Amino acid sequence: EAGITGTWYNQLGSTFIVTAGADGALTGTYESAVGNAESRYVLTGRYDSAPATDGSGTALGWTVAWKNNYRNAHSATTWSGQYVGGAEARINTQWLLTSGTTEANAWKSTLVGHDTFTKVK
Amino acid sequence: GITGTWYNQLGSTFIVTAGADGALTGTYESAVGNAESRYVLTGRYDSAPATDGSGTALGWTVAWKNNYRNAHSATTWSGQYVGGAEARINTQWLLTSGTTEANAWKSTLVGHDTFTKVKP
Amino acid sequence: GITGTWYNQLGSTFIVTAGADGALTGTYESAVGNAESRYVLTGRYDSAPATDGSGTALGWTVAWKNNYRNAHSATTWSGQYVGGAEARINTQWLLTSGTTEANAWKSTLVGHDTFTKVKP
Amino acid sequence: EAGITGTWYNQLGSTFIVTAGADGALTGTYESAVGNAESRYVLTGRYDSAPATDGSGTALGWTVAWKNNYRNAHSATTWSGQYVGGAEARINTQWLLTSGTTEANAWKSTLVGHDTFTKVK
Numbered sequence A, D: 001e002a003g004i005t006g007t008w009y010n011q012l013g014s015t016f017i018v019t020a021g022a023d024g025a026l027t028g029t030y031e032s033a034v035g036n037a038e039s040r041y042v043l044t045g046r047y048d049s050a051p052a053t054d055g056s057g058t059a060l061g062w063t064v065a066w067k068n069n070y071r072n073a074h075s076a077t078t079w080s081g082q083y084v085g086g087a088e089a090r091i092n093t094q095w096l097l098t099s100g101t102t103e104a105n106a107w108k109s110t111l112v113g114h115d116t117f118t119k120v121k
Numbered sequence B, C: 001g002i003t004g005t006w007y008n009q010l011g012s013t014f015i016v017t018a019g020a021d022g023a024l025t026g027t028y029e030s031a032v033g034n035a036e037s038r039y040v041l042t043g044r045y046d047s048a049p050a051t052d053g054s055g056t057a058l059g060w061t062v063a064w065k066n067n068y069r070n071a072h073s074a075t076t077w078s079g080q081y082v083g084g085a086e087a088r089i090n091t092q093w094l095l096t097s098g099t100t101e102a103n104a105w106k107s108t109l110v111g112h113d114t115f116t117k118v119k120p
Protein backbone atom coordinates (compact mmCIF):
# COMPACT_ATOMS: atom_id res chain seq x y z
CA GLU A 1 0.00 0.00 0.00
CA ALA A 2 2.42 2.89 0.81
CA GLY A 3 4.87 0.25 -0.31
CA ILE A 4 3.30 -0.37 -3.72
CA THR A 5 2.11 3.14 -4.29
CA GLY A 6 4.49 5.20 -6.39
CA THR A 7 6.40 5.36 -9.66
CA TRP A 8 8.20 2.36 -11.02
CA TYR A 9 10.39 1.72 -14.12
CA ASN A 10 11.21 -1.70 -15.77
CA GLN A 11 14.19 -3.01 -17.67
CA LEU A 12 12.74 -1.81 -20.98
CA GLY A 13 12.42 1.75 -19.71
CA SER A 14 8.65 1.60 -19.32
CA THR A 15 6.92 3.66 -16.57
CA PHE A 16 4.28 2.35 -14.17
CA ILE A 17 2.50 4.89 -11.85
CA VAL A 18 0.23 3.21 -9.35
CA THR A 19 -1.88 3.85 -6.28
CA ALA A 20 -2.68 0.93 -3.95
CA GLY A 21 -6.03 1.42 -2.20
CA ALA A 22 -6.97 0.11 1.24
CA ASP A 23 -9.53 -2.25 -0.38
CA GLY A 24 -6.93 -4.09 -2.52
CA ALA A 25 -7.36 -1.90 -5.63
CA LEU A 26 -4.54 -0.88 -7.95
CA THR A 27 -5.14 2.13 -10.22
CA GLY A 28 -2.79 4.18 -12.32
CA THR A 29 -1.14 4.62 -15.70
CA TYR A 30 1.38 2.72 -17.77
CA GLU A 31 3.73 4.01 -20.47
CA SER A 32 5.48 1.41 -22.54
CA ALA A 33 8.94 1.97 -24.01
CA VAL A 34 8.24 -0.60 -26.73
CA GLY A 35 5.52 -1.95 -28.99
CA ASN A 36 2.45 -0.46 -30.55
CA ALA A 37 2.05 2.13 -27.85
CA GLU A 38 2.44 5.84 -27.17
CA SER A 39 1.68 8.00 -24.14
CA ARG A 40 -0.06 6.72 -21.00
CA TYR A 41 -2.64 4.00 -20.72
CA VAL A 42 -5.06 3.24 -17.91
CA LEU A 43 -4.22 0.33 -15.67
CA THR A 44 -6.30 -1.40 -13.07
CA GLY A 45 -5.54 -4.37 -10.85
CA ARG A 46 -5.64 -5.96 -7.42
CA TYR A 47 -3.17 -6.80 -4.68
CA ASP A 48 -3.22 -8.80 -1.39
CA SER A 49 -3.99 -6.08 1.13
CA ALA A 50 -3.20 -8.31 4.12
CA PRO A 51 -0.13 -10.24 3.01
CA ALA A 52 1.97 -12.70 4.91
CA THR A 53 4.43 -11.22 7.35
CA ASP A 54 6.79 -14.16 7.17
CA GLY A 55 9.26 -12.79 4.57
CA SER A 56 7.06 -13.55 1.53
CA GLY A 57 6.23 -11.10 -1.25
CA THR A 58 2.84 -9.49 -1.72
CA ALA A 59 0.91 -10.99 -4.63
CA LEU A 60 -0.55 -8.60 -7.18
CA GLY A 61 -1.59 -8.21 -10.79
CA TRP A 62 -2.80 -5.59 -13.21
CA THR A 63 -4.08 -5.13 -16.76
CA VAL A 64 -3.53 -2.55 -19.48
CA ALA A 65 -5.70 -2.57 -22.60
CA TRP A 66 -3.56 -0.81 -25.23
CA LYS A 67 -6.17 1.76 -26.21
CA ASN A 68 -5.91 5.39 -25.15
CA ASN A 69 -7.14 8.60 -26.72
CA TYR A 70 -4.13 8.55 -29.11
CA ARG A 71 -3.64 4.93 -30.30
CA ASN A 72 -5.27 1.52 -30.27
CA ALA A 73 -3.18 -1.65 -30.67
CA HIS A 74 -6.19 -4.02 -30.20
CA SER A 75 -4.36 -5.87 -27.46
CA ALA A 76 -4.12 -6.17 -23.67
CA THR A 77 -1.33 -7.17 -21.26
CA THR A 78 -1.71 -8.63 -17.80
CA TRP A 79 1.16 -8.69 -15.30
CA SER A 80 1.08 -11.23 -12.44
CA GLY A 81 3.71 -11.05 -9.77
CA GLN A 82 4.81 -10.02 -6.30
CA TYR A 83 5.99 -6.91 -4.55
CA VAL A 84 9.13 -7.32 -2.47
CA GLY A 85 9.33 -4.44 -0.01
CA GLY A 86 12.23 -2.83 1.73
CA ALA A 87 14.59 -0.03 0.88
CA GLU A 88 15.16 -1.43 -2.66
CA ALA A 89 11.63 -2.36 -3.43
CA ARG A 90 10.91 -4.51 -6.49
CA ILE A 91 7.92 -5.82 -8.32
CA ASN A 92 8.80 -9.06 -10.10
CA THR A 93 6.34 -10.13 -12.77
CA GLN A 94 5.45 -12.42 -15.61
CA TRP A 95 3.09 -11.12 -18.25
CA LEU A 96 0.75 -12.20 -21.03
CA LEU A 97 0.05 -9.92 -24.01
CA THR A 98 -2.98 -11.02 -26.01
CA SER A 99 -3.80 -9.44 -29.34
CA GLY A 100 -7.21 -9.58 -30.87
CA THR A 101 -6.99 -12.04 -33.79
CA THR A 102 -9.17 -13.85 -36.20
CA GLU A 103 -10.11 -17.37 -35.15
CA ALA A 104 -7.61 -18.90 -37.60
CA ASN A 105 -4.83 -16.83 -36.05
CA ALA A 106 -5.78 -17.38 -32.40
CA TRP A 107 -2.96 -19.86 -31.87
CA LYS A 108 -0.49 -16.96 -32.22
CA SER A 109 -2.43 -14.40 -30.19
CA THR A 110 -0.43 -14.37 -26.97
CA LEU A 111 3.13 -13.34 -26.11
CA VAL A 112 4.70 -14.16 -22.72
CA GLY A 113 7.50 -12.43 -20.92
CA HIS A 114 8.83 -11.12 -17.64
CA ASP A 115 9.39 -7.61 -16.29
CA THR A 116 11.18 -6.44 -13.15
CA PHE A 117 10.13 -3.05 -11.77
CA THR A 118 12.28 -0.82 -9.60
CA LYS A 119 10.67 1.85 -7.44
CA VAL A 120 11.82 5.43 -7.94
CA LYS A 121 11.21 8.72 -5.88
CA GLY B 1 -21.43 -8.57 -25.33
CA ILE B 2 -18.80 -9.04 -22.62
CA THR B 3 -21.16 -7.98 -19.84
CA GLY B 4 -22.81 -10.95 -18.20
CA THR B 5 -22.30 -14.14 -16.29
CA TRP B 6 -19.70 -16.54 -17.61
CA TYR B 7 -18.57 -20.05 -16.62
CA ASN B 8 -15.31 -21.82 -17.40
CA GLN B 9 -14.43 -25.49 -17.91
CA LEU B 10 -13.81 -25.91 -14.16
CA GLY B 11 -17.25 -24.55 -13.29
CA SER B 12 -16.00 -21.20 -11.96
CA THR B 13 -18.35 -18.22 -12.24
CA PHE B 14 -17.17 -14.90 -13.69
CA ILE B 15 -19.69 -12.05 -13.40
CA VAL B 16 -18.55 -8.93 -15.18
CA THR B 17 -19.62 -5.51 -16.43
CA ALA B 18 -17.83 -3.97 -19.38
CA GLY B 19 -17.85 -0.18 -19.05
CA ALA B 20 -18.16 1.86 -22.21
CA ASP B 21 -14.57 3.16 -22.13
CA GLY B 22 -12.75 -0.03 -21.37
CA ALA B 23 -13.25 -1.00 -17.73
CA LEU B 24 -14.02 -4.51 -16.55
CA THR B 25 -15.50 -4.77 -13.08
CA GLY B 26 -17.03 -7.79 -11.37
CA THR B 27 -16.66 -10.83 -9.22
CA TYR B 28 -15.08 -14.26 -9.57
CA GLU B 29 -15.98 -17.47 -7.78
CA SER B 30 -13.52 -20.31 -8.31
CA ALA B 31 -14.62 -23.93 -8.29
CA VAL B 32 -11.05 -25.03 -7.32
CA GLY B 33 -8.16 -23.99 -5.21
CA ASN B 34 -7.80 -22.06 -1.93
CA ALA B 35 -10.95 -20.07 -2.57
CA GLU B 36 -14.52 -19.71 -1.33
CA SER B 37 -17.35 -17.41 -2.40
CA ARG B 38 -16.84 -14.34 -4.57
CA TYR B 39 -13.74 -12.25 -5.02
CA VAL B 40 -13.41 -8.78 -6.49
CA LEU B 41 -12.03 -8.51 -10.01
CA THR B 42 -11.01 -5.56 -12.15
CA GLY B 43 -9.57 -5.38 -15.63
CA ARG B 44 -9.59 -3.71 -19.02
CA TYR B 45 -10.77 -4.50 -22.52
CA ASP B 46 -10.46 -2.95 -26.00
CA SER B 47 -13.56 -0.76 -26.22
CA ALA B 48 -13.09 -0.19 -30.00
CA PRO B 49 -12.04 -3.55 -31.48
CA ALA B 50 -11.01 -4.06 -35.11
CA THR B 51 -13.79 -4.53 -37.61
CA ASP B 52 -12.16 -7.40 -39.53
CA GLY B 53 -13.45 -10.44 -37.63
CA SER B 54 -10.89 -10.22 -34.86
CA GLY B 55 -11.67 -10.86 -31.22
CA THR B 56 -11.70 -8.24 -28.50
CA ALA B 57 -8.58 -8.23 -26.32
CA LEU B 58 -9.09 -8.14 -22.57
CA GLY B 59 -7.61 -9.03 -19.22
CA TRP B 60 -8.48 -9.01 -15.54
CA THR B 61 -7.05 -9.71 -12.10
CA VAL B 62 -8.29 -11.35 -8.90
CA ALA B 63 -6.37 -11.11 -5.63
CA TRP B 64 -7.50 -14.14 -3.63
CA LYS B 65 -8.50 -12.30 -0.45
CA ASN B 66 -12.11 -11.81 0.62
CA ASN B 67 -13.99 -11.89 3.94
CA TYR B 68 -13.69 -15.69 4.12
CA ARG B 69 -10.16 -16.56 3.05
CA ASN B 70 -6.80 -15.16 1.99
CA ALA B 71 -4.62 -17.37 -0.21
CA HIS B 72 -1.88 -14.71 -0.50
CA SER B 73 -2.02 -15.04 -4.30
CA ALA B 74 -3.33 -13.34 -7.39
CA THR B 75 -4.41 -14.53 -10.84
CA THR B 76 -4.41 -12.57 -14.06
CA TRP B 77 -6.32 -13.74 -17.15
CA SER B 78 -5.30 -12.43 -20.59
CA GLY B 79 -7.35 -13.28 -23.63
CA GLN B 80 -9.96 -12.31 -26.16
CA TYR B 81 -13.74 -12.23 -26.42
CA VAL B 82 -15.20 -13.85 -29.50
CA GLY B 83 -18.78 -12.88 -30.18
CA GLY B 84 -21.35 -14.82 -32.10
CA ALA B 85 -24.08 -17.33 -31.35
CA GLU B 86 -22.05 -18.97 -28.68
CA ALA B 87 -19.93 -16.17 -27.37
CA ARG B 88 -16.62 -17.19 -25.78
CA ILE B 89 -13.81 -15.70 -23.81
CA ASN B 90 -10.55 -17.62 -24.41
CA THR B 91 -7.82 -16.95 -21.91
CA GLN B 92 -4.42 -17.87 -20.57
CA TRP B 93 -3.72 -17.11 -16.93
CA LEU B 94 -0.86 -16.62 -14.46
CA LEU B 95 -1.42 -17.40 -10.74
CA THR B 96 1.36 -15.92 -8.60
CA SER B 97 1.63 -16.78 -4.91
CA GLY B 98 3.61 -14.66 -2.51
CA THR B 99 6.87 -16.48 -1.81
CA THR B 100 10.25 -15.88 -0.35
CA GLU B 101 12.93 -14.82 -2.81
CA ALA B 102 14.54 -18.28 -2.71
CA ASN B 103 11.20 -19.83 -3.71
CA ALA B 104 10.27 -17.36 -6.32
CA TRP B 105 11.16 -19.83 -9.05
CA LYS B 106 8.07 -21.84 -8.06
CA SER B 107 5.75 -18.88 -7.46
CA THR B 108 3.76 -18.85 -10.69
CA LEU B 109 1.31 -21.36 -12.16
CA VAL B 110 0.15 -21.01 -15.79
CA GLY B 111 -2.98 -22.34 -17.39
CA HIS B 112 -5.82 -21.67 -19.77
CA ASP B 113 -9.55 -21.14 -19.21
CA THR B 114 -12.36 -20.91 -21.76
CA PHE B 115 -15.56 -19.18 -20.72
CA THR B 116 -19.09 -19.31 -22.14
CA LYS B 117 -22.42 -18.03 -20.85
CA VAL B 118 -23.78 -21.57 -20.55
CA LYS B 119 -24.51 -22.57 -16.96
CA PRO B 120 -23.40 -25.93 -15.84
CA GLY C 1 0.71 -45.71 -24.57
CA ILE C 2 2.54 -42.55 -25.65
CA THR C 3 3.96 -44.18 -28.77
CA GLY C 4 1.83 -43.49 -31.80
CA THR C 5 0.36 -40.87 -34.06
CA TRP C 6 -1.34 -37.94 -32.41
CA TYR C 7 -3.31 -34.93 -33.71
CA ASN C 8 -4.03 -31.63 -31.99
CA GLN C 9 -6.94 -29.18 -32.23
CA LEU C 10 -5.22 -27.36 -35.13
CA GLY C 11 -4.86 -30.57 -37.12
CA SER C 12 -1.09 -30.89 -36.61
CA THR C 13 0.39 -34.39 -36.65
CA PHE C 14 2.75 -35.58 -33.90
CA ILE C 15 4.34 -38.99 -34.53
CA VAL C 16 6.35 -40.20 -31.59
CA THR C 17 8.14 -43.19 -30.08
CA ALA C 18 8.53 -43.42 -26.33
CA GLY C 19 11.73 -45.28 -25.48
CA ALA C 20 11.72 -47.53 -22.44
CA ASP C 21 14.00 -45.28 -20.36
CA GLY C 22 12.42 -41.94 -21.04
CA ALA C 23 13.26 -40.78 -24.55
CA LEU C 24 10.75 -39.24 -26.93
CA THR C 25 11.76 -39.27 -30.58
CA GLY C 26 9.66 -38.44 -33.63
CA THR C 27 8.38 -35.95 -36.11
CA TYR C 28 5.98 -33.01 -36.06
CA GLU C 29 3.97 -31.55 -38.92
CA SER C 30 2.25 -28.27 -38.12
CA ALA C 31 -1.02 -27.28 -39.74
CA VAL C 32 -0.24 -23.57 -39.11
CA GLY C 33 2.60 -21.14 -39.12
CA ASN C 34 5.88 -20.88 -41.06
CA ALA C 35 6.12 -24.63 -41.49
CA GLU C 36 5.82 -27.32 -44.15
CA SER C 37 6.20 -31.09 -43.99
CA ARG C 38 7.78 -32.90 -41.04
CA TYR C 39 10.27 -31.62 -38.54
CA VAL C 40 12.46 -33.57 -36.14
CA LEU C 41 11.41 -33.64 -32.50
CA THR C 42 13.07 -34.97 -29.37
CA GLY C 43 11.99 -34.93 -25.76
CA ARG C 44 11.67 -36.81 -22.50
CA TYR C 45 8.92 -38.39 -20.44
CA ASP C 46 8.56 -39.97 -16.99
CA SER C 47 9.18 -43.66 -17.67
CA ALA C 48 7.94 -44.70 -14.17
CA PRO C 49 4.86 -42.56 -13.44
CA ALA C 50 3.02 -42.54 -10.12
CA THR C 51 0.48 -45.27 -9.57
CA ASP C 52 -2.23 -43.05 -8.04
CA GLY C 53 -4.17 -41.97 -11.13
CA SER C 54 -1.79 -39.20 -12.08
CA GLY C 55 -0.77 -38.42 -15.64
CA THR C 56 2.67 -38.99 -17.11
CA ALA C 57 4.78 -35.84 -17.36
CA LEU C 58 6.53 -35.18 -20.65
CA GLY C 59 7.95 -32.54 -22.94
CA TRP C 60 9.47 -32.16 -26.37
CA THR C 61 11.08 -29.64 -28.70
CA VAL C 62 10.91 -28.84 -32.41
CA ALA C 63 13.35 -26.45 -34.08
CA TRP C 64 11.52 -25.22 -37.17
CA LYS C 65 14.23 -26.02 -39.72
CA ASN C 66 13.94 -28.86 -42.23
CA ASN C 67 14.88 -29.35 -45.90
CA TYR C 68 12.01 -27.10 -47.02
CA ARG C 69 11.96 -24.13 -44.67
CA ASN C 70 13.69 -22.46 -41.73
CA ALA C 71 11.56 -20.22 -39.52
CA HIS C 72 14.47 -19.46 -37.15
CA SER C 73 12.30 -20.54 -34.20
CA ALA C 74 11.71 -23.38 -31.81
CA THR C 75 8.70 -24.66 -29.86
CA THR C 76 8.70 -26.62 -26.65
CA TRP C 77 5.60 -28.47 -25.40
CA SER C 78 5.31 -29.34 -21.69
CA GLY C 79 2.45 -31.45 -20.46
CA GLN C 80 1.12 -34.80 -19.37
CA TYR C 81 -0.21 -37.97 -20.99
CA VAL C 82 -3.51 -39.22 -19.66
CA GLY C 83 -4.26 -42.80 -20.58
CA GLY C 84 -7.62 -44.44 -20.83
CA ALA C 85 -10.18 -45.13 -23.53
CA GLU C 86 -9.51 -41.85 -25.22
CA ALA C 87 -5.91 -41.20 -24.41
CA ARG C 88 -4.85 -37.55 -24.40
CA ILE C 89 -1.75 -35.46 -24.19
CA ASN C 90 -2.50 -32.03 -22.67
CA THR C 91 0.18 -29.44 -23.18
CA GLN C 92 1.23 -25.83 -22.89
CA TRP C 93 3.87 -24.58 -25.30
CA LEU C 94 6.42 -21.80 -25.77
CA LEU C 95 7.44 -20.74 -29.33
CA THR C 96 10.60 -18.64 -29.28
CA SER C 97 11.81 -16.88 -32.42
CA GLY C 98 15.35 -15.67 -32.79
CA THR C 99 15.32 -11.90 -32.31
CA THR C 100 17.66 -9.06 -31.66
CA GLU C 101 18.20 -8.17 -28.03
CA ALA C 102 16.00 -5.07 -28.34
CA ASN C 103 13.14 -7.26 -29.62
CA ALA C 104 13.53 -10.05 -27.20
CA TRP C 105 10.51 -8.87 -25.26
CA LYS C 106 8.35 -10.03 -28.19
CA SER C 107 10.25 -13.24 -28.94
CA THR C 108 8.02 -15.82 -27.26
CA LEU C 109 4.47 -16.93 -28.00
CA VAL C 110 2.57 -19.12 -25.49
CA GLY C 111 -0.32 -21.43 -26.10
CA HIS C 112 -1.90 -24.77 -25.36
CA ASP C 113 -2.44 -27.87 -27.48
CA THR C 114 -4.44 -31.01 -26.71
CA PHE C 115 -3.61 -34.17 -28.62
CA THR C 116 -5.59 -37.36 -29.22
CA LYS C 117 -5.04 -40.32 -31.54
CA VAL C 118 -8.20 -39.50 -33.50
CA LYS C 119 -7.48 -38.52 -37.09
CA PRO C 120 -9.27 -35.56 -38.46
CA GLU D 1 27.19 -25.37 -32.28
CA ALA D 2 30.72 -24.67 -30.90
CA GLY D 3 28.86 -21.67 -29.56
CA ILE D 4 26.16 -23.62 -27.73
CA THR D 5 28.31 -26.56 -26.80
CA GLY D 6 29.74 -26.33 -23.30
CA THR D 7 28.90 -25.83 -19.64
CA TRP D 8 26.42 -23.25 -18.52
CA TYR D 9 25.11 -22.07 -15.10
CA ASN D 10 21.82 -20.15 -14.36
CA GLN D 11 20.82 -17.63 -11.72
CA LEU D 12 19.69 -20.40 -9.37
CA GLY D 13 23.07 -22.11 -9.52
CA SER D 14 21.88 -24.95 -11.73
CA THR D 15 24.31 -26.59 -14.22
CA PHE D 16 23.55 -27.33 -17.87
CA ILE D 17 26.14 -29.39 -19.89
CA VAL D 18 25.26 -29.61 -23.56
CA THR D 19 26.57 -30.72 -26.91
CA ALA D 20 25.10 -29.18 -30.08
CA GLY D 21 25.24 -31.61 -33.02
CA ALA D 22 25.56 -30.67 -36.68
CA ASP D 23 22.01 -32.00 -37.32
CA GLY D 24 20.35 -29.59 -34.83
CA ALA D 25 20.43 -31.98 -31.84
CA LEU D 26 21.06 -30.93 -28.25
CA THR D 27 22.17 -33.63 -25.80
CA GLY D 28 23.57 -33.42 -22.32
CA THR D 29 22.81 -33.32 -18.61
CA TYR D 30 21.11 -30.92 -16.24
CA GLU D 31 21.61 -30.49 -12.48
CA SER D 32 19.09 -28.36 -10.71
CA ALA D 33 19.98 -26.31 -7.63
CA VAL D 34 16.34 -26.35 -6.51
CA GLY D 35 13.23 -28.51 -6.39
CA ASN D 36 12.64 -32.21 -6.18
CA ALA D 37 15.93 -33.06 -7.82
CA GLU D 38 19.36 -34.46 -7.09
CA SER D 39 22.34 -35.28 -9.30
CA ARG D 40 22.26 -35.09 -13.11
CA TYR D 41 19.36 -35.69 -15.41
CA VAL D 42 19.31 -36.41 -19.13
CA LEU D 43 18.35 -33.57 -21.41
CA THR D 44 17.54 -33.59 -25.08
CA GLY D 45 16.50 -30.80 -27.41
CA ARG D 46 16.87 -29.05 -30.73
CA TYR D 47 18.36 -25.81 -32.01
CA ASP D 48 18.34 -23.85 -35.33
CA SER D 49 21.52 -25.12 -36.97
CA ALA D 50 21.45 -22.45 -39.69
CA PRO D 51 20.38 -19.32 -37.84
CA ALA D 52 20.03 -15.80 -39.10
CA THR D 53 23.24 -13.86 -39.45
CA ASP D 54 21.58 -10.50 -39.01
CA GLY D 55 22.23 -9.99 -35.27
CA SER D 56 19.39 -12.27 -34.08
CA GLY D 57 19.71 -15.02 -31.49
CA THR D 58 19.65 -18.72 -32.29
CA ALA D 59 16.37 -20.35 -31.29
CA LEU D 60 16.55 -23.52 -29.21
CA GLY D 61 14.75 -25.63 -26.65
CA TRP D 62 15.28 -28.66 -24.49
CA THR D 63 13.47 -30.98 -22.07
CA VAL D 64 14.39 -32.67 -18.80
CA ALA D 65 12.12 -35.33 -17.32
CA TRP D 66 12.97 -35.30 -13.59
CA LYS D 67 13.68 -39.01 -13.31
CA ASN D 68 17.21 -40.35 -12.98
CA ASN D 69 18.62 -43.45 -11.34
CA TYR D 70 18.40 -41.71 -7.92
CA ARG D 71 15.07 -39.81 -7.78
CA ASN D 72 11.80 -39.36 -9.61
CA ALA D 73 9.75 -36.16 -9.20
CA HIS D 74 7.06 -37.23 -11.76
CA SER D 75 7.54 -34.00 -13.66
CA ALA D 76 9.24 -32.52 -16.73
CA THR D 77 10.54 -29.05 -17.63
CA THR D 78 10.93 -27.58 -21.09
CA TRP D 79 13.07 -24.50 -21.74
CA SER D 80 12.40 -22.41 -24.88
CA GLY D 81 14.74 -19.59 -25.73
CA GLN D 82 17.64 -18.22 -27.73
CA TYR D 83 21.39 -18.34 -27.66
CA VAL D 84 23.12 -14.99 -27.95
CA GLY D 85 26.72 -15.58 -29.00
CA GLY D 86 29.84 -13.56 -28.53
CA ALA D 87 32.46 -13.35 -25.85
CA GLU D 88 29.79 -13.23 -23.09
CA ALA D 89 27.48 -15.81 -24.46
CA ARG D 90 24.02 -16.20 -22.95
CA ILE D 91 21.06 -18.47 -23.30
CA ASN D 92 17.87 -16.62 -22.37
CA THR D 93 14.89 -18.84 -21.70
CA GLN D 94 11.35 -19.22 -20.49
CA TRP D 95 10.31 -22.57 -19.10
CA LEU D 96 7.30 -24.72 -18.29
CA LEU D 97 7.43 -27.34 -15.52
CA THR D 98 4.56 -29.81 -15.69
CA SER D 99 3.92 -32.26 -12.89
CA GLY D 100 1.92 -35.39 -13.36
CA THR D 101 -1.42 -34.81 -11.59
CA THR D 102 -4.78 -36.35 -11.21
CA GLU D 103 -7.42 -34.99 -13.58
CA ALA D 104 -9.02 -32.91 -10.80
CA ASN D 105 -5.66 -31.27 -10.09
CA ALA D 106 -4.63 -30.68 -13.71
CA TRP D 107 -5.42 -26.98 -13.50
CA LYS D 108 -2.44 -26.58 -11.14
CA SER D 109 -0.04 -28.86 -13.00
CA THR D 110 2.24 -26.31 -14.65
CA LEU D 111 4.68 -23.73 -13.30
CA VAL D 112 6.21 -21.03 -15.55
CA GLY D 113 9.42 -19.13 -15.14
CA HIS D 114 12.53 -17.77 -16.79
CA ASP D 115 16.20 -18.72 -16.58
CA THR D 116 19.28 -16.96 -17.93
CA PHE D 117 22.33 -19.14 -18.57
CA THR D 118 25.91 -17.91 -18.64
CA LYS D 119 28.58 -19.94 -20.40
CA VAL D 120 31.60 -21.01 -18.37
CA LYS D 121 35.06 -22.58 -19.37
Ligand SMILES: O=C(O)CCCC[C@@H]1SC[C@@H]2NC(=O)N[C@@H]21
Pocket (backbone or CB within 6 Å): A010, A012, A014, A031, A032, A033, A034, A035, A036, A037, A066, A073, A074, A075, A076, A077, A095, A097, A099, A113, A115, C105
Ligand atom coordinates in the same frame (compact mmCIF):
# COMPACT_ATOMS: atom_id res chain seq x y z
O1 LIG E 1 2.42 -3.82 -28.93
C1 LIG E 1 1.34 -3.83 -28.25
O2 LIG E 1 0.36 -4.64 -28.59
C2 LIG E 1 1.15 -2.89 -27.12
C3 LIG E 1 2.33 -2.60 -26.28
C4 LIG E 1 2.78 -3.84 -25.50
C5 LIG E 1 4.07 -3.61 -24.76
C6 LIG E 1 4.44 -4.58 -23.73
S1 LIG E 1 3.55 -5.11 -22.42
C7 LIG E 1 4.70 -6.24 -21.81
C8 LIG E 1 6.03 -5.54 -22.07
N1 LIG E 1 6.42 -4.73 -20.91
C9 LIG E 1 6.49 -3.42 -21.27
O3 LIG E 1 6.82 -2.52 -20.47
N2 LIG E 1 6.21 -3.25 -22.56
C10 LIG E 1 5.90 -4.54 -23.22
Ligand SMILES: O=C(O)CCCC[C@@H]1SC[C@@H]2NC(=O)N[C@@H]21
Pocket (backbone or CB within 6 Å): B008, B010, B012, B029, B030, B031, B032, B033, B034, B035, B064, B071, B073, B074, B075, B093, B095, B111, B113, D107
Ligand atom coordinates in the same frame (compact mmCIF):
# COMPACT_ATOMS: atom_id res chain seq x y z
O1 LIG F 1 -5.50 -21.40 -4.82
C1 LIG F 1 -5.39 -20.19 -4.91
O2 LIG F 1 -4.26 -19.58 -4.73
C2 LIG F 1 -6.59 -19.31 -5.21
C3 LIG F 1 -7.54 -19.87 -6.22
C4 LIG F 1 -6.99 -20.00 -7.59
C5 LIG F 1 -7.88 -20.65 -8.59
C6 LIG F 1 -7.54 -20.61 -10.03
S1 LIG F 1 -7.34 -19.13 -10.89
C7 LIG F 1 -6.94 -19.92 -12.38
C8 LIG F 1 -7.89 -21.12 -12.42
N1 LIG F 1 -9.18 -20.80 -13.02
C9 LIG F 1 -10.17 -20.90 -12.12
O3 LIG F 1 -11.40 -20.70 -12.38
N2 LIG F 1 -9.73 -21.34 -10.95
C10 LIG F 1 -8.25 -21.51 -10.94
Ligand SMILES: O=C(O)CCCC[C@@H]1SC[C@@H]2NC(=O)N[C@@H]21
Pocket (backbone or CB within 6 Å): A107, C008, C010, C012, C029, C030, C031, C032, C033, C034, C035, C064, C071, C073, C074, C075, C093, C095, C111, C113
Ligand atom coordinates in the same frame (compact mmCIF):
# COMPACT_ATOMS: atom_id res chain seq x y z
O1 LIG G 1 5.76 -20.22 -37.36
C1 LIG G 1 6.72 -20.78 -36.88
O2 LIG G 1 7.68 -20.13 -36.29
C2 LIG G 1 6.89 -22.28 -36.96
C3 LIG G 1 5.62 -23.06 -36.77
C4 LIG G 1 5.03 -22.96 -35.42
C5 LIG G 1 3.72 -23.63 -35.22
C6 LIG G 1 3.16 -23.81 -33.86
S1 LIG G 1 4.00 -24.66 -32.62
C7 LIG G 1 2.76 -24.38 -31.44
C8 LIG G 1 1.46 -24.54 -32.23
N1 LIG G 1 0.99 -25.92 -32.28
C9 LIG G 1 1.02 -26.40 -33.53
O3 LIG G 1 0.65 -27.56 -33.86
N2 LIG G 1 1.39 -25.47 -34.40
C10 LIG G 1 1.75 -24.19 -33.73
Ligand SMILES: O=C(O)CCCC[C@@H]1SC[C@@H]2NC(=O)N[C@@H]21
Pocket (backbone or CB within 6 Å): B105, D010, D012, D014, D031, D032, D033, D034, D035, D036, D037, D066, D073, D074, D075, D076, D077, D095, D097, D099, D113, D115
Ligand atom coordinates in the same frame (compact mmCIF):
# COMPACT_ATOMS: atom_id res chain seq x y z
O1 LIG H 1 10.73 -30.02 -8.52
C1 LIG H 1 10.68 -30.69 -9.60
O2 LIG H 1 9.54 -31.17 -10.05
C2 LIG H 1 11.94 -30.99 -10.34
C3 LIG H 1 12.98 -29.94 -10.37
C4 LIG H 1 12.51 -28.72 -11.16
C5 LIG H 1 13.49 -27.57 -11.06
C6 LIG H 1 13.34 -26.47 -12.01
S1 LIG H 1 13.26 -26.52 -13.68
C7 LIG H 1 13.03 -24.84 -13.95
C8 LIG H 1 13.91 -24.20 -12.88
N1 LIG H 1 15.26 -23.96 -13.40
C9 LIG H 1 16.16 -24.69 -12.68
O3 LIG H 1 17.39 -24.64 -12.90
N2 LIG H 1 15.58 -25.38 -11.70
C10 LIG H 1 14.11 -25.17 -11.71
